[PDB]
Design an enzyme around this catalytic site. Structure first.
Site, short mmCIF file in Angstrom:
data_model
loop_
_atom_site.label_atom_id
_atom_site.label_comp_id
_atom_site.label_asym_id
_atom_site.label_seq_id
_atom_site.Cartn_x
_atom_site.Cartn_y
_atom_site.Cartn_z
N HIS A 102 -19.14 -123.56 -42.91
CA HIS A 102 -18.60 -122.27 -43.75
C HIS A 102 -18.61 -122.34 -45.04
O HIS A 102 -17.82 -121.89 -45.98
CB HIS A 102 -17.06 -122.52 -43.45
CG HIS A 102 -16.54 -122.10 -42.01
ND1 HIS A 102 -16.03 -120.83 -41.70
CD2 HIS A 102 -16.70 -123.13 -40.92
CE1 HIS A 102 -15.79 -121.07 -40.40
NE2 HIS A 102 -15.92 -122.23 -39.96
N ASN A 175 -10.40 -118.46 -37.53
CA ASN A 175 -11.94 -117.62 -37.33
C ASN A 175 -11.34 -116.10 -36.95
O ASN A 175 -10.19 -115.99 -36.63
CB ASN A 175 -12.59 -118.21 -36.42
CG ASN A 175 -13.40 -119.61 -37.18
OD1 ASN A 175 -13.28 -119.78 -38.14
ND2 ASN A 175 -13.77 -120.42 -36.18
N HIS A 366 -7.05 -127.37 -45.10
CA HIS A 366 -6.96 -128.31 -43.98
C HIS A 366 -5.89 -127.64 -42.84
O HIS A 366 -4.80 -127.46 -43.24
CB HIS A 366 -6.55 -129.42 -44.69
CG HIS A 366 -6.48 -130.91 -43.77
ND1 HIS A 366 -6.88 -130.66 -42.33
CD2 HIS A 366 -6.34 -132.04 -44.00
CE1 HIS A 366 -6.96 -131.85 -41.79
NE2 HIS A 366 -6.65 -132.69 -42.95
C1 HEM Z 1 -10.52 -123.82 -33.71
C2 HEM Z 1 -11.79 -124.37 -34.22
C3 HEM Z 1 -12.18 -124.32 -35.76
C4 HEM Z 1 -11.83 -123.23 -36.51
C5 HEM Z 1 -10.97 -121.91 -36.35
C6 HEM Z 1 -12.35 -123.93 -37.98
C7 HEM Z 1 -12.39 -123.24 -39.09
C8 HEM Z 1 -12.90 -123.59 -40.36
C9 HEM Z 1 -12.76 -122.70 -41.41
C10 HEM Z 1 -12.37 -121.29 -41.47
C11 HEM Z 1 -13.39 -123.59 -42.61
C12 HEM Z 1 -13.73 -122.75 -43.87
C13 HEM Z 1 -12.54 -123.37 -44.76
C14 HEM Z 1 -12.99 -122.65 -46.24
O1 HEM Z 1 -13.10 -121.65 -46.47
O2 HEM Z 1 -13.01 -123.58 -47.08
C15 HEM Z 1 -13.74 -124.69 -41.80
C16 HEM Z 1 -14.41 -125.77 -42.61
C17 HEM Z 1 -14.66 -126.88 -41.94
N1 HEM Z 1 -14.27 -127.38 -40.79
FE1 HEM Z 1 -13.14 -126.35 -39.11
N2 HEM Z 1 -12.96 -124.98 -37.59
C18 HEM Z 1 -13.06 -125.51 -36.46
C19 HEM Z 1 -13.49 -126.66 -35.84
C20 HEM Z 1 -13.83 -127.87 -36.70
C21 HEM Z 1 -13.97 -129.22 -35.95
C22 HEM Z 1 -13.68 -129.47 -34.50
C23 HEM Z 1 -14.15 -129.91 -36.93
C24 HEM Z 1 -14.45 -131.66 -37.04
C25 HEM Z 1 -13.88 -132.12 -36.11
C26 HEM Z 1 -14.26 -129.22 -38.34
C27 HEM Z 1 -14.57 -129.50 -39.55
C28 HEM Z 1 -14.49 -128.68 -40.51
C29 HEM Z 1 -15.03 -129.21 -41.87
C30 HEM Z 1 -15.27 -130.68 -42.02
C31 HEM Z 1 -15.12 -128.11 -42.57
C32 HEM Z 1 -15.28 -128.10 -44.28
C33 HEM Z 1 -14.16 -128.23 -45.09
C34 HEM Z 1 -14.25 -128.51 -46.40
O3 HEM Z 1 -15.57 -128.86 -46.92
O4 HEM Z 1 -13.41 -128.15 -47.00
N3 HEM Z 1 -13.95 -127.79 -38.00
N4 HEM Z 1 -13.54 -124.84 -40.51
#
Ligand code: HEM
Ligand code: HEM
Ligand code: HEM
Lengths: 727, 309, 727, 83
Positions: A102, A175, A366
């Site tokens: 993202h 999402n 988060h």
């Molecule tokens: C329902 C499943 C998931 C959804 C809806 C989701 C949604 C998101 C969203 C919207 C962002 C962007 C936030 C922003 O705009 O800064 C993001 C970033 C991220 N996601 Fe998730 N994600 C999902 C699953 C996962 C999983 C399973 C992991 C790891 C186990 C994960 C790890 C991350 C990380 C590491 C970032 C970057 C955060 C940052 O650098 O601040 N995501 N995700």
């Protein structure tokens, strides 16, 4: 100095203006009186400029910001030039790692308010009173691409909201589709590495249309539900304002009695649901890679605030096992026909940021950031998410004090015994840095959980089982939700899905991968499978034709809330119309035209074959916003061509192409008077065609017709006729 | 396991094949017989995969790479799952800051050889003998866009060459136009901020077509020369193989006698010069944002080795 | 919980109190009314504690800060415990790289004020008016040792002052000796690596007494000057308050008329110059590794504010070449007998920090941080320094925004076009991020140089010569400054220098290195060389005995300003005396003793063989500060033993040892009435001896005699008598 | 991760295993290991799913946690037996 034009035309007016009327600006300069608690508490770090001297970061004023210090005017630069070195050093260290996923996203500030007190189901303070306003900072995004990738790619979209409550930050990180691709967080790196650019050569950017994505999908049928949504028009939203938002996972609301209610979070677009068509989205990635980011920014500057209704699907604890899918299974949606969404509040996005990097790039959301009143569940995808966001932020934002970055700070009190860390801002005066202590009388102190303003206590869920690395057998069903999604689509939505699969698999180099994907489709629906197969020159086998379709979901054979378009919900306010000018326009058509758009809040862009201005029949001087090639039909929702001297543009290849493109992409076209000669370019019968507004002049009936078409968004009855248009 | 197809059509032939004929692959698997001194010394860090067990980074074999450890199959994930945390932790920390400028680039290994000894004008060892071959690593790039931006934008292009000589690394860091936009390094942050995405909204990506850029240009006439070049078809090369390259600055060559000669460095495309037309270039940023990266990779895989004098 | 004592004794009074009287505390709680502009501007980041709820960093209140979340009270810890994870995560990332050199330091807030305008010689705003007060933050330090090494090691001391001026930060980064070890900055890594712990085993910490240092010194005779200073008592200062400070390099002052004047910066300790003796310093590194840090802090809590006078050695541009030594050579001092130090202003340090990590640990000082009115010179050590501080701070402090860490921020305006970077706090609203621009009318703007508030412009020094990597031949003289220093010392100082070299060379394992350093000493002075050689069992050769001594420095055969003690300058206020109690002290003696000390601002510590209280002969209850073994004689300046029941401690080994140690380390001792039975312990004749105060009681002139001795710091006449004595 | 500057600390010489290590983790600051595997994910067919998971067993087997029975409610509580 004085480099600004004497007429003041370098500075945009600090009042709401339509897209392209003024130069865009920093939010606080464009709408200084749009305020909220979060925006006002950012005022301590905001920095002005006007009337200030240019200085080093130590406050030393600079006399010459054009030259390095050298020995002689053609000599060598000298090491003692500390002004040059600070400036180049700061420049050399501007970048920080982009988000792992993202990375590409656009954000805005706004506010949230509940429709009623929800204290019967949750003690969350931000949900406790309709008069409690909570400042929000929302970031929308794509998934796969880099921070420099394009907006209108085919992709799931992120929809993250940071609520600045009085009892803590609550980040709702969702999402635009109701499920995820995978079940257990342990597979996230595998999935994400499959969709991201392939490791040898780092191609392709921002696309799932490559071998490793379809390889993973072919080998992991849990992914098929989200893949269906991605291949539908849901994966190419017209705008962040016209798409849904979902938390995906089942969470918990905890009330003051301690009762837990399972909940799934929803954002309903008050502008309605609307998507692009693939050829238009892909062409848009080349003409305007910033389309969504621009549209968001300019909708807010125009006063077309993105507004969403917060909705909850509520399921009692006793109903945990009443469905034929697991509620903790993130690849499963909860059909609104089985469990309705309860409209709980409204969120309005009404002010852009001041500095993109400081506020959007550094923002850290988060899902683990919850507040008393909410709690987790055992969803194995959610469970793993709780670890990652905290971990990734240590390196992305350089340390454990990322909550001191202004956009991330809570607006409520925060006191604890945590100290130090790189870039520590807070200077603690507490004599103690540990508890229990007697030297500061044990402050700050723990607080018992309670009805309001209490400390966080987890819901006491019963946990029974052996320590195992095992997928729950209840999660092992992968085709009924994809089938339900498929049957809930209109015919043209179905056709778009087929076309999404066919185009993507055509880019898979290894043919066996495409065949394994078509085999998966055969387990979902034979018509979908055959139609994709036919586009790939594949023949289903005997065995594949007899695959028994998956069972319905709890008796459902469809659910219209899964379609973008089955149930009419379109809104024209904030949409845009391109007006193709000629050198002697019938000024009476323009007035009728512009008066009508303006009453519906629809914007216009005046287009010509050159910049400058043209003059109407009566002598009205019409300013041109762009050319035909420079602001292509891809950027507008409809095209109107007023009468006048059509011979000026009737042989303009660009003018003809403008209509053919708009035609191909199912957009409403309106032709007044002699503009009707363009019918031949898009081969429209003499009797007319639904989708094409045409009249002797641009009266009120004509504008009502066009505006009706715009509310229906696109002319789906034209699909069959676009085959035969070379565009 | 039995995952690869029985006919072996998952693996690309290890031989020169034309664009589109086989799936592209890592260079040392695609062309295992190609070597140079630099490629050979990279051998101690290359890691294989076939026939190996899947392990943590500490070398512990993994039995189940599909699931987290939890208390019951529908239970909470446990903190003791060190395999999950190592895997997600490494994934969480994969990115590093992209380059400040020229973040978007494509590179390849190769070699250089001088036609004749240049010891009369320079004592540089890598130019001292027609038989002396120098491994190189070259990265081509755009200027403004992020690492994830499109290749065929209108832009100046970087052409950086790392020469692994026997007396040191020599980096020849140039562009595809003979001059730069500005005269003094002190203004670099000004020019680059003006060309990059405007600070309030971070638009537009990878383009100079916006107000701050032309604002800067209009107030700093020294930029006009490189702007001319950028507005010409030089700003939209057909391929990294059909563009010239220049070091831009006058450097010095120093011979054994201590005599200095002013020099300007040039790269001549042996495939000749060629560019797209604007409409085609802009539409290609949409249809294939990786078009130049892809074209470079595929030319090498096909044996159409990019050559420069 | 409510853990403090009901008596309120966990909390030190917010008033000046003597060392040991109360628990020390964060500056703003201990002296809330001591303010300055910088102290006030930090109020935006100071964080309180009392009466606040304990929370996460996101503002969520915590209920149970004693336990992790688990599945059962004896079950496994759950990944979903986000409170545990944020708490451990911040703790896990508390550390940042320590400074490459000067990692061990102690700092305080204060203010500076000039005695008169210096506008005739410099246009520097902080020196233009005696009523203009400049806040400062000062850090004193050792050189080689880590942040956890000991205070009282033998070493040069750093003395860095951050001046928060109205025209920018000015950092004056000097040491406690007027020259440095090396001439060109290219050898800094070599010198520093040689003095730091040897690479294979990382030994020894905080000391130059090892082979690699002495190897480097013996191959680079440019180091001898500063090695002499380090081997003298200068290397083991009694306190940061009793040492001199120097900028070392020649800089320039630029007045409004554009005239450049050469300047060397000096700080004079208003408490006088005082050092420890080697045995005491070394032992103090074990008994109290934080002695200097502690003394500085407690001095400020007691009101004994460290005060220094800023002084300038001024040399006209025309006199650049008039000395025997090059003015731009940092291994050469400017003898005060040739160029007097002109008094410029007073610096007072009157408040400790609140949080050591936040203010001290993250403070970034840089000698390149100058302001209009000052300028550099070509001194080659200085020239390379200008590159290093900026560079090192990008990694130590995490990025290019270290000027935004509260302690480092300018109090004056700062505005420029620099953006982003890790940990960016400032949210810029300027539409422009480049200049020249028209969109913000070119703001912020450059400002021409002028008499006041103008932009920085470097002095137009003529530059001429070829591009060379060459030491100036004028720098090639290494022995006359060392000789001048040596001849300016008292005889007991010379002996201390001889003992320093002897001890240090004795830890060098390779004998030839010891021989080589002896050969270098023989080029400075024969008496010095022979005395050191004798201590090492080395004989000088006939050639070494005939080396001709280096020339005088501009006719000078000595300069008393170079001695610590040649010219008395003793100040007793803030010193501390140990009072050895017994279980029935004559209270009459104690009353006389305590009052007299208090009258001179001399502190006392009541010591005994146990903690608790003892009761004087009249029933006065006497609170005990520490035991004889717990607060050893190393930590006081003098020892007083009052009469009473002396038989109580007469046979106390620790009590006797206490006097032996204080006697050995040349400290004044006073024995009242029967306390004179301790004379046998230190072998004092019946008739007495200079340095020992003795009387039938502590009345009359007894305290005046002891205080006269304290004013002369130590009893140098006793040296020969300590030779023997087993302590 | 902050002490040693990123996630590739296992590649700092003193920390490297002397036995084989192969997986699908990639990148990170100061990455030494150059992976040639066409796949950076599993399951994959393009590298025939290598490197592969290995079942638990008597020797050279994959890690499997001991299947301890877990029974209790989610609580932040000290066991009374620790008191
Ligand atoms: C329902 C499943 C998931 C959804 C809806 C989701 C949604 C998101 C969203 C919207 C962002 C962007 C936030 C922003 O705009 O800064 C993001 C970033 C991220 N996601 Fe998730 N994600 C999902 C699953 C996962 C999983 C399973 C992991 C790891 C186990 C994960 C790890 C991350 C990380 C590491 C970032 C970057 C955060 C940052 O650098 O601040 N995501 N995700
Ligand atoms: C003659 C004018 C210039 C040319 C031909 C040029 C060329 C290049 C090229 C080709 C790259 C990309 C290297 C790669 O492929 O990794 C690059 C990157 C860079 N350029 Fe220059 N550049 C010029 C001017 C400047 C100036 C004046 C500065 C600053 C004073 C500058 C600072 C940088 C930086 C910081 C990077 C990123 C390097 C990295 O992160 O490794 N460039 N430049
Ligand atoms: C006249 C000679 C020198 C003097 C008086 C001097 C003085 C000091 C002092 C007092 C400090 C500690 C500042 C604090 O308390 O934070 C310091 C640190 C330091 N010195 Fe200098 N030094 C000298 C020479 C050099 C040279 C030649 C270099 C390298 C070219 C150098 C590089 C450093 C660095 C990198 C630091 C650490 C700064 C930080 O981490 O902020 N010093 N020096």
């Amino acid at each position: 100095d004085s480099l600004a034009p004497e007429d003041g035309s370098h500075r945009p007016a600090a009042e709401p203006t339509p897209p392209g009327a003024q130069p865009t600006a920093p939010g606080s300069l464009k709408a200084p009186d749009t305020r909220n608690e979060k925006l006002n508490s950012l005022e301590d770090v905001r920095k002005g400029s006007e009337n200030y001297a240019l200085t080093t970061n130590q406050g030393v004023r600079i006399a010459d910001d054009q030259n390095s210090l050298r020995a002689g005017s053609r000599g060598p630069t000298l090491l003692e030039d500390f002004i040059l070195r600070e400036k180049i050093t700061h420049f050399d260290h501007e970048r920080i790692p982009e988000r792992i996923v993202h990375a590409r996203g656009s954000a805005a500030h706004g506010y949230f308010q509940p429709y009623k007190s929800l204290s019967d189901i949750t003690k969350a303070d931000f949900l406790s009173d309709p008069n409690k306003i909570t400042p929000v900072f929302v970031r929308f995004s794509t998934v796969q691409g880099g921070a420099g990738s394009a907006d209108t790619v085919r992709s799931i979209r992120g929809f993250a909201t940071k609520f600045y409550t009085e009892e803590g930050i609550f980040d709702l990180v969702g999402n635009n589709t109701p499920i995820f691709f995978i079940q257990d967080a342990h597979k996230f790196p595998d999935f994400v590495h499959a969709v991201k650019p392939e490791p040898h050569w780092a191609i392709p950017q921002g696309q799932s249309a490559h071998d490793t994505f379809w390889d993973y999908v072919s080998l992991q049928p849990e992914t098929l539900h989200n893949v269906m949504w991605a291949m539908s028009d849901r994966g190419i939203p017209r705008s962040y304002r016209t798409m849904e938002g979902f938390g995906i996972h089942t969470f918990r609301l905890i009330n003051a009695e301690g009762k837990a209610t399972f909940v799934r979070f929803h954002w309903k677009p008050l502008a309605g649901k609307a998507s692009l068509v693939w050829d238009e989205a892909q062409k848009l990635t080349g003409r305007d890679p910033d389309f969504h980011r621009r549209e968001l920014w300019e909708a807010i500057e125009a006063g077309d605030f993105p507004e969403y209704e917060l909705g909850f699907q509520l399921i009692p604890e006793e109903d945990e096992f009443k469905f034929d899918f697991d509620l903790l299974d993130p690849t499963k949606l909860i059909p609104e026909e089985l469990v309705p969404v309860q409209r709980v509040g409204k969120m309005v996005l009404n002010r852009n940021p001041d500095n993109f990097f400081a506020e959007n790039e550094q923002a850290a959301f988060h899902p683990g950031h919850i507040v008393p009143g909410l709690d987790f569940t055992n969803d194995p995808l959610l469970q793993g998410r709780l670890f990652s966001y905290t971990d990734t932020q240590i390196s992305r934002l350089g340390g454990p004090n990322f909550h001191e970055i202004p956009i991330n700070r809570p607006t409520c009190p925060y006191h604890n015994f945590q100290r130090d860390g790189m870039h520590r801002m807070g200077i603690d005066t507490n004599p103690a840095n540990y508890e229990p202590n007697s030297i500061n009388d044990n402050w700050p102190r723990e607080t018992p959980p309670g009805p309001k303003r209490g400390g966080f206590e987890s819901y006491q869920e019963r946990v029974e089982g052996n320590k195992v690395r095992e997928r729950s057998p209840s999660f092992g069903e992968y085709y009924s939700h994809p089938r339900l999604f498929w049957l809930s689509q209109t015919p043209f939505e179905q056709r778009h899905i087929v076309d999404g699969f066919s185009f993507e698999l055509s880019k898979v180099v290894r043919p066996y991968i495409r065949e394994r994907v078509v085999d998966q489709l055969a387990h979902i629906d034979l018509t979908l499978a055959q139609a994709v197969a036919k586009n790939l020159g594949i023949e289903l086998t005997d065995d594949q034709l007899n695959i028994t379709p998956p069972p319905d979901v709890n008796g459902l054979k469809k659910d219209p809330s899964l379609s973008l378009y089955a149930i009419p919900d379109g809104d024209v306010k904030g949409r845009v119309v391109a007006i193709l000018l000629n050198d002697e326009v019938r000024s009476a058509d323009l007035l009728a035209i512009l008066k009508a758009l303006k009453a519906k809040g629809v914007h216009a862009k005046l287009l010509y074959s050159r910049m400058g201005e043209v003059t109407a029949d009566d002598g009205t001087v019409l300013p041109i916003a762009a050319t035909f090639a420079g602001a292509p039909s891809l950027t507008v929702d409809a095209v109107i061509v007023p009468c006048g001297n059509i011979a000026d543009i009737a042989d303009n290849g660009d003018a003809n192409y403008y209509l053919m493109e708009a035609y191909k992409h199912l957009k409403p076209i309106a032709l007044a008077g002699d503009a009707r000669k363009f019918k031949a370019t898009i081969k429209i019968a003499d009797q007319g065609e639904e989708g094409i507004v045409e009249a002797d002049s641009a009266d009120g009936s004509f504008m009502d017709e066009l505006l009706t078409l715009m509310a229906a968004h696109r002319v789906w009855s034209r699909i069959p006729k676009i085959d035969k248009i070379p565009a």
